[PDB]
Design a protein around this motif. Structure first.
Motif, short mmCIF file in Angstrom:
data_model
loop_
_atom_site.label_atom_id
_atom_site.label_comp_id
_atom_site.label_asym_id
_atom_site.label_seq_id
_atom_site.Cartn_x
_atom_site.Cartn_y
_atom_site.Cartn_z
N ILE A 207 -56.21 74.28 53.30
CA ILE A 207 -55.86 72.87 53.44
C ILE A 207 -56.51 72.28 54.68
O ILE A 207 -57.11 71.20 54.64
CB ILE A 207 -54.32 72.70 53.46
N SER A 208 -56.39 72.99 55.81
CA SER A 208 -56.98 72.51 57.05
C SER A 208 -58.50 72.46 56.96
O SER A 208 -59.12 71.59 57.59
CB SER A 208 -56.55 73.39 58.22
N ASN A 209 -59.11 73.37 56.21
CA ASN A 209 -60.57 73.34 56.07
C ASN A 209 -61.02 72.22 55.14
O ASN A 209 -62.03 71.56 55.40
CB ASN A 209 -61.08 74.68 55.57
N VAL A 210 -60.27 71.98 54.05
CA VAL A 210 -60.74 71.05 53.02
C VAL A 210 -60.41 69.60 53.37
O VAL A 210 -61.07 68.68 52.88
CB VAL A 210 -60.15 71.45 51.66
N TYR A 211 -59.38 69.36 54.20
CA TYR A 211 -59.01 67.98 54.50
C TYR A 211 -60.10 67.30 55.33
O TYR A 211 -60.36 66.12 55.12
CB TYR A 211 -57.65 67.99 55.23
N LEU A 212 -60.79 68.06 56.19
CA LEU A 212 -61.74 67.51 57.17
C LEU A 212 -62.81 66.63 56.54
O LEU A 212 -63.15 65.56 57.07
CB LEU A 212 -62.39 68.66 57.95
N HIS A 213 -63.35 67.05 55.39
CA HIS A 213 -64.45 66.30 54.79
C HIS A 213 -63.95 65.00 54.17
O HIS A 213 -64.62 63.96 54.26
CB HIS A 213 -65.20 67.16 53.77
N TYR A 214 -62.78 65.04 53.54
CA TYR A 214 -62.19 63.82 53.02
C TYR A 214 -61.64 62.92 54.11
O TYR A 214 -61.46 61.72 53.88
CB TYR A 214 -61.08 64.17 52.02
N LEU A 215 -61.35 63.47 55.29
CA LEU A 215 -61.03 62.64 56.45
C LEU A 215 -62.28 61.97 57.00
O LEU A 215 -62.21 60.83 57.47
CB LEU A 215 -60.37 63.49 57.54
N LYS A 216 -63.42 62.67 56.94
CA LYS A 216 -64.69 62.01 57.21
C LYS A 216 -64.93 60.88 56.21
O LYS A 216 -65.41 59.80 56.58
CB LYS A 216 -65.84 63.02 57.18
N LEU A 217 -64.59 61.11 54.94
CA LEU A 217 -64.50 59.99 54.00
C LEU A 217 -63.37 59.04 54.40
O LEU A 217 -63.52 57.82 54.30
CB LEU A 217 -64.29 60.51 52.58
N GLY A 218 -62.25 59.58 54.86
CA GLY A 218 -61.16 58.79 55.41
C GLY A 218 -60.44 57.89 54.43
O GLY A 218 -60.17 56.73 54.75
N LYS A 219 -60.12 58.40 53.24
CA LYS A 219 -59.47 57.58 52.21
C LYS A 219 -57.96 57.47 52.39
O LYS A 219 -57.35 56.59 51.78
CB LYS A 219 -59.77 58.16 50.82
N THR A 220 -57.34 58.32 53.20
CA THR A 220 -55.89 58.43 53.27
C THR A 220 -55.30 57.39 54.22
O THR A 220 -56.01 56.76 55.02
CB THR A 220 -55.49 59.84 53.69
N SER A 221 -53.98 57.22 54.14
CA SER A 221 -53.25 56.22 54.91
C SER A 221 -52.74 56.81 56.22
O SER A 221 -52.94 57.99 56.52
CB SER A 221 -52.10 55.64 54.09
N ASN A 222 -52.05 55.98 57.01
CA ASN A 222 -51.70 56.38 58.37
C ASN A 222 -50.53 57.37 58.40
O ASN A 222 -50.51 58.26 59.26
CB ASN A 222 -51.41 55.13 59.22
N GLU A 223 -49.56 57.24 57.49
CA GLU A 223 -48.51 58.23 57.33
C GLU A 223 -48.91 59.37 56.39
O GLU A 223 -48.19 60.37 56.32
CB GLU A 223 -47.22 57.56 56.82
N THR A 224 -50.03 59.23 55.67
CA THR A 224 -50.45 60.28 54.75
C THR A 224 -50.79 61.56 55.49
O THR A 224 -50.46 62.66 55.02
CB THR A 224 -51.64 59.78 53.93
N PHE A 225 -51.45 61.46 56.64
CA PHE A 225 -51.70 62.65 57.46
C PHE A 225 -50.40 63.28 57.93
O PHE A 225 -50.23 64.50 57.86
CB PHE A 225 -52.57 62.30 58.66
N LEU A 226 -49.48 62.45 58.42
CA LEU A 226 -48.29 62.99 59.08
C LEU A 226 -47.31 63.60 58.09
O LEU A 226 -46.53 64.47 58.48
CB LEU A 226 -47.62 61.90 59.91
N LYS A 227 -47.33 63.16 56.83
CA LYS A 227 -46.52 63.77 55.78
C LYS A 227 -47.26 64.89 55.06
O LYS A 227 -46.62 65.81 54.53
CB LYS A 227 -46.07 62.71 54.77
N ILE A 228 -48.59 64.86 55.04
CA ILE A 228 -49.34 66.04 54.61
C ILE A 228 -49.12 67.17 55.60
O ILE A 228 -49.20 68.35 55.23
CB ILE A 228 -50.83 65.70 54.41
#
Length: 398
Positions: free
Chosen positions: A346-367
Motif C-alpha cells: 500500500i505504501s509503495n503503490v500509493y506514491l505514484h497515484y499521489l504524484k497523480l494526486g487524485k485523492t481528497s484531503n481526508e482520503t489520505f488520513l482515512k486511508i
C-alpha cells in the motif's frame, strides 16, 4: 490399442480330449483358403460399398442381450461393431440423418448392463469422436458430461487419465471447444468446469491443462465471458495451489503471470469482479514456499502500478480498489504471523497515484486508518510508524 480378442472356452499350449484326427487339418485348410479371400478388402476395402444401409444393418444386428453361450465374446463383439461403424461413418460425411441414428444407437449400447472397465473406457472415445463429427446434438453431450463422466468416479481414476489413453481425451474434448457450433453451450454449462477442476487436481494433467488455457486466452478473448469467469479463476487458483516438492515451481509461475496479464483487456468488469483476481493474487502471498510468495508480491506490485486505470464507468477512485479485496485476506497460530506480510504494497503503490494526486484531503488520513494501527505487537509497533514516516517526505512531490 488393439481390441480385446474374443477368447475361446479352452486353450491348449504345445486327459483333455482336444480334436485329434481330421479336425486340425480341416482348420488349417479353412484358414489357408479363407486368407486368400481378402476378407479385409472384400467389402470395406474400396469406397463404393460404403452406404448408410450397411451401417444400419451393422448396428441393428449387434447382439445386446446376455446369455450363457454368448458371454464368452460379448465385449469383443460390441467393440468390433463400434470400431467398424466409427470408421465407415468417418468415410461417409452426412450430418442430417445418419449421425443422429448412429449416435443414438451407440448411446443405447453404452447403457447396457454388465460391462467391465476396459470395454467402457474403449467405448467412450468413440462417443467423443461422434460428438466431434456430429452437429446440433448438444443433448447427448449433456448426458455424457453430466451422468457418465462426472458422477461415475470408480471407473475413471487418476491411473486411467495418466496413460496415453487419457491424452486422447484431453486433446479431443478440449479441441471440441474450438468447434464453431457447440462453443456457447460449452461455456454456458456448469458441470463442465466442475469436471475440469476435479481432473485438474491430478498431478500429471496440470501442465497440459495450462497448455490449453494459455493458448485459448492468448489467441483471443473468446473464452472469457461474465457468466463463465468465476470458475475459470478458481481453476487457475488450483494451478497456483500446487507446489510443495521440483516441477510445480517451474509450472505455476506461468499461471501467476497469466493471472496478472488477464486484467488488461477490453473492459469486461460487470460491477465488482476485478476484486476477485486481486483477492486471488493476494491469496498467492499466503503460500509457504519462498519463491512463489516473492513472485506473487512482485507481480502484484507490477500490475497495480500500470495495469488499471482509475476513472471509468465502474471504478470511481482508487480507494474502493484498495478497500475491496485485499483486507478480505486479513478478514479471517497462523493468523498472528500471517498478517505481517503485505503491508508494504500500500505504501509503495500509493506514491505514484499521489504524484497523480487524485485523492481528497481526508482520503489520505482515512486511508491511514484503513492501513491499520492495530499495535499491541512487537513487529507491528516498530513496523507501522517507520513505514508511514515516508508520508512526510512526499509533500514536496506536489
Amino acid at each position: 490399442s488393439n481390441l480385446p480378442k474374443p477368447s475361446p472356452e479352452i486353450s491348449i499350449n504345445k486327459g483333455d480330449e482336444e480334436p485329434t484326427e481330421e479336425e486340425i487339418k480341416s482348420s488349417k485348410k479353412a484358414m489357408e483358403c479363407i486368407k486368400s479371400s481378402n476378407i479385409a478388402a472384400s467389402v470395406f476395402g474400396n469406397e463404393s460399398n460404403i452406404t448408410a444401409d450397411l451401417i444400419k444393418t451393422l448396428l441393428d444386428s449387434a447382439k445386446t442381450e446376455k446369455n450363457a453361450d454368448n458371454s464368452r465374446y460379448f465385449e469383443a463383439e460390441l467393440l468390433f461393431i463400434i470400431e467398424l461403424t466409427i470408421a465407415l461413418f468417418l468415410f461417409c460425411k452426412e450430418e442430417k440423418e445418419l449421425g443422429k441414428f448412429i449416435l443414438q444407437k451407440v448411446f443405447q449400447l453404452s447403457h447396457t448392463k454388465g460391462l467391465t472397465k476396459r470395454t467402457v473406457r474403449r467405448m467412450l472415445t468413440y462417443k467423443i469422436l461422434l460428438i466431434s463429427l456430429c452437429a446440433d446434438q448438444t443433448e447427448y453431450l449433456s448426458k455424457l458430461i453430466n451422468d457418465e463422466l462426472l458422477k461415475k468416479g470408480d471407473i475413471f481414476t487418476q491411473k486411467f487419465f495418466a496413460t496415453n489413453q487419457g491424452k486422447e481425451f484431453l486433446k479431443r474434448l478440449f479441441s471440441l471447444t474450438e468447434s464453431e457450433f457447440y462453443r456457447g453451450f460449452l461455456l454456458g454449462n456448469e458441470n463442465f468446469w466442475k469436471f475440469l477442476r476435479k481432473v485438474t487436481a491430478m498431478k500429471e494433467q496440470s501442465e497440459s491443462i495450462f497448455e490449453y488455457l494459455n493458448e485459448s486466452i492468448k489467441t483471443d478473448s473468446n473464452i472469457l465471458t461474465n457468466e463463465n469467469f468465476m470458475w475459470v479463476l478458481g481453476l487457475l487458483d488450483e494451478i497456483s495451489s500446487m507446489g510443495a516438492v521440483k516441477k510445480s515451481i517451474e509450472l505455476s509461475l506461468k499461471s501467476i503471470q497469466l493471472t496478472s496479464h488477464l486484467l488488461e483487456d477490453n473492459n469486461d468488469l460487470r460491477k465488482n469482479e476485478i476484486f476477485a483476481i486481486i483477492q486471488a493474487l493476494a491469496h498467492q502471498c499466503i503460500n509457504p514456499c519462498k519463491q512463489i510468495s516473492e513472485f506473487a508480491v512482485v507481480t502484484l506490485e507490477q500490475t497495480l502500478i500500470n495495469k488499471i486505470e482509475i476513472p471509468t464507468n465502474e471504478m470511481e477512485s482508487v480507494e474502493e480498489l484498495i478497500e475491496g479485496g485485499l483486507l478480505p485476506l486479513l478478514n479471517s497460530e497462523d493468523q498472528k504471523i500471517l498478517i505481517s506480510s503485505i503491508l508494504t504494497i500500500i505504501s509503495n503503490v500509493y506514491l505514484h497515484y499521489l504524484k497523480l494526486g487524485k485523492t481528497s484531503n481526508e482520503t489520505f488520513l482515512k486511508i491511514l486508518s484503513i492501513f491499520n494501527k492495530f499495535v499491541e505487537d512487537s513487529d507491528i509497533e516498530k513496523k507501522l510508524q517507520q513505514l508511514i514516516l515516508d508520508k512526510k517526505s512526499i509533500e514536496k512531490g506536489n
